[PDB]
Amino acid sequence: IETLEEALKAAEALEREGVHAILDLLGEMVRTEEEARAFQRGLLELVWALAGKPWPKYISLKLTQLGLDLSEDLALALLREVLREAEPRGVFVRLDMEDSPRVEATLRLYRALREEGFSQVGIVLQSYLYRTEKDLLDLLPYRPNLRLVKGAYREPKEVAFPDKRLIDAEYLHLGKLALKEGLYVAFATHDPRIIAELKRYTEAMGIPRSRFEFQFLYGVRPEEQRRLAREGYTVRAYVPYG
Ligand SMILES: Cc1cc2nc3c(=O)[nH]c(=O)nc-3n(C[C@H](O)[C@H](O)[C@H](O)COP(=O)(O)O)c2cc1C
């Protein structure tokens, strides 16, 4: 998948099988505010093309591609402009969580936008960081729509659990904590141990299937994806393009 057209066909094919799509525009690495605005135009194109596609409309983005480090204010201003367009079309925008020095700014942006009244925006939290439980607790008043991941970056042992056993343990802790608090939670993991435990837990707790989902990368464990959709789970696959 390279182009938007190829990505939207991929979404079509998933939908035939009861699985949903998350569209993720990757661009060249944004080096300047002008590049952040060019990336923004690619996002506005994405929103436009998803508009009145009949199925659920979800995009994922990286805030560094809107110039987060160059200027948080500008990244916020450009994201706001995107959400003003996306909200009225029913397009949900997930803010992908990047590496640890960018976490505080990411949460400030999310909080700011929520406080302005946008509601079809979510966050990602990563179980490998020490800081994540407090971030989750701090965010409960906002009622976040939350995607839970383990974490994709090499991080130092002062900020992240060094042990994979601890990373996995924190994932289940945070997941259950979020669900017990009433948040919609997307579980973005391939780990069959964690998936089995979460299916067990939601059943035992009587958490309806409409309150959580599973997320997989496009093409990874595709049988499992179809199996979960057949059992009535909300399942999404993440489709990068660009
Ligand atoms: C659908 C989806 C979305 C993701 N979004 C993020 C993100 O925003 N930030 C991040 O660090 N990792 C993200 N990840 C990566 C996870 O951190 C993890 O590295 C990867 O899926 C492998 O771990 P797992 O299958 O054992 O849970 C995502 C993974 C999936 C499947």
Parent domain of 231 = 1-242
Written as six digits, the tokens of 156 are: 């130092």
Gaps after residue numbers in the chain (C–N over 2.5 angstroms): none
The response to whether 173 counts as a known ligand-binding position is no
Task: Kindly state the greatest CA–CA separation across the chain.
Answer: 51
Closest approach atom of ligand 1 to CA 95: 8
Q: Is the beta carbon of 127 within 6 A of some atom in ligand 1?
A: no
Burial class (CB in 10 A: 0-12, 13-18, 19+), 63: buried
Where residue 165 falls (left for φ over 0; alpha for ψ -120 to 50; beta otherwise) is alpha
Alpha-carbon gap, residue 32 to 136, rounded angstroms: 31
Name the closest-CA residue to atom 5, ligand 1: 96
Cα(165) to ligand 1 centroid in Å equals: 16
Alpha-carbon gap, residue 224 to 216, rounded angstroms: 9
Alpha-carbon gap, residue 165 to 155, rounded angstroms: 16
What single letter denotes the amino acid at residue 161? F
Residues in the chain: 242
Resolution number, Å: 2.2
DSSP type of residue 30? P
Q: At what angle do helices 72-86 and 33-50 cross, to 10 degrees?
A: 20
Q: Do residues 97 and 60 make contact, with C-beta atoms less than 8 angstroms apart?
A: no
For residue 126, list its beta bridge partners: 149
Q: What is the dihedral of CA 39, 129, 151, 55, to 10 degrees?
A: -60
Angle among Cα 61, 66, 69 to the nearest 5 degrees reads 115
Q: Is the beta carbon of 198 within 6 A of some atom in ligand 1?
A: no
Q: Into how many domains does the chain fold? A: 1
Scanning the structure block, which residue is given the tokens 């973005």?
Answer: 188
Residues 6+ apart with CB under 8 A from 83: 93, 113, 118, 120, 121
Domain holding 31: CATH number? 3.20.20.220
Alpha-carbon gap, residue 163 to 169, rounded angstroms: 10
Strand residues in the chain grouped as ranges (E): 20-25, 57-62, 91-96, 121-126, 146-149, 185-188, 212-217, 234-241
Cα(198) to ligand 1 centroid in Å equals: 16
Written as six digits, the tokens of 21 are: 């799509």
The response to whether 40 counts as a known ligand-binding position is no
Cα(189) to ligand 1 centroid in Å equals: 6
Method: X-ray
